[PDB]
Amino acid sequence: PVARSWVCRKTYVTPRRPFEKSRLDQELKLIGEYGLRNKREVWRVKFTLAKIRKAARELLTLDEKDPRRLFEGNALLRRLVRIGVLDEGKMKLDYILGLKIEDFLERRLQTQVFKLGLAKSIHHARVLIRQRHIRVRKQVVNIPSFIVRLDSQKHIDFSLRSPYGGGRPGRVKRKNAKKG
């Protein structure tokens, strides 16, 4: 007997066909467009989208006036419009089925700090986040896969200790200025 919890789960699904050319090109296009590291991130976002779609289908097979459908569909739509994937005007269960993977990839912190002009490219966005230059509200966020909520979009600043937002020169700048 241990107090430890063994609860864990795999956050992605490996494709059934390993060498489908169309799937390889589509995943590579997603990777290049959003600056992802490997296929596993695409498969991860795919798994989240698939689970959301499965929940939406299961709720849709229910009676419309069934209380569980109302409660859980409302919660799911509220979460989807909370993270910005779903528009507040489109708040029906069958509107969940029309979501893409790019909808979720757009809400990543990497994509957001690229879009908000903080970085020159998406790979610069990744290296900026990984190097602790980006903060969400008051919290220094270090994860590029961090999914930004709508109420958190307006607070993505350049950190108060970063050389780009706080004005303490980095190791390289200080070392170079010493020789000067």
Partner: protein
């Protein structure tokens, strides 16, 4: 610049003759603030002497913004020596634990188990 101290969840435990609280330490560009000066800031803030203040469990948040810990402020030093864990008193130099390992004590007990009478004290 300076270190800020706030006390989120304050309660007065008259059962244990103390005040217990959660301490938020704001220190944007410093290492985790030492407990010895958190205690003196709490002493100034709550108008008491810093030897009845026991602070523990301080966890700095990712990025270096603030550190969260827990703290007690006892009505008197005697009530502190009564209601405080021995290790936290020892952190203040108010208690010294035994200088023997578990192995030494266990084999001493099992060796004493083999003798009867006053001779038990003759083996150590």
């Amino acid at each position: 610049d300076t270190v800020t101290i706030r006390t989120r969840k304050f309660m007065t435990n008259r059962l244990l003759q103390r005040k217990q609280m959660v301490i938020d330490v704001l220190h944007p560009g410093k290492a985790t603030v030492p407990k010895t000066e958190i205690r003196e800031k709490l002493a100034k803030m709550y108008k008491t002497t810093p030897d009845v203040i026991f602070v523990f469990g301080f966890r700095t948040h990712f990025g270096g913004g603030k550190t969260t810990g827990f703290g007690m402020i006892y009505d008197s030093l005697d009530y502190a020596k009564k209601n405080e864990p021995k290790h936290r008193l020892a952190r203040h130099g108010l208690y010294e634990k035994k200088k023997t390992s578990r192995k030494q004590r266990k084999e001493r007990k099992n060796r004493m188990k083999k003798v009867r009478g006053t001779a038990k004290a003759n083996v150590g």
